[PDB]
Amino acid sequence: DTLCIGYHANNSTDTVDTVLEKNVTVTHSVNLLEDKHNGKLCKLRGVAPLHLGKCNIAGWILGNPECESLSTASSWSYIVETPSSDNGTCYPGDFIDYEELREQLSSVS
C-alpha cells in the first residue's frame, strides 16, 4: 500500500533558459517578445498617415507639378514617403531649414 507525491508532465516541448541551464523544457510558458509584424502601415491613432507617393515633402509642400493629385487630409498622424520620393524642388537651390519643417509638418490635427 503506497502513496506518492509527484507533479505534472505533458507533451509540450517549449524550452526556456534559466541562469543555470540553457534549453530547459517546460510544461508551460509565455513569450514576452513581439517577434512578428503585420506588414502594413496602419492608422496610427484613429487617424491615418499622410502618404505622398512620388513626391517627397518638399515637392508636396511647394506644389511640384507632379505631386498635384494628392488628397491632402484635414489632418494626419505621421508622414509616409517612399525611397522613390525624389520629386522635390524641381528647380535647383537650397530649401532652408528643411528638416525643421519636416519634423513640424510631421503630424497635424
Binding site: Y7, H8, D17, V26, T27, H28, N31
Partner: peptide, 14 residues
C-alpha cells in the same frame, strides 16, 4: 534578443 520565453509551469520530465 531572439527569444524571451518566460517559464510559467514545471520542468517537463515525462
Amino acid at each position: 534578443s531572439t527569444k524571451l520565453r518566460l517559464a510559467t509551469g514545471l520542468r517537463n520530465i515525462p
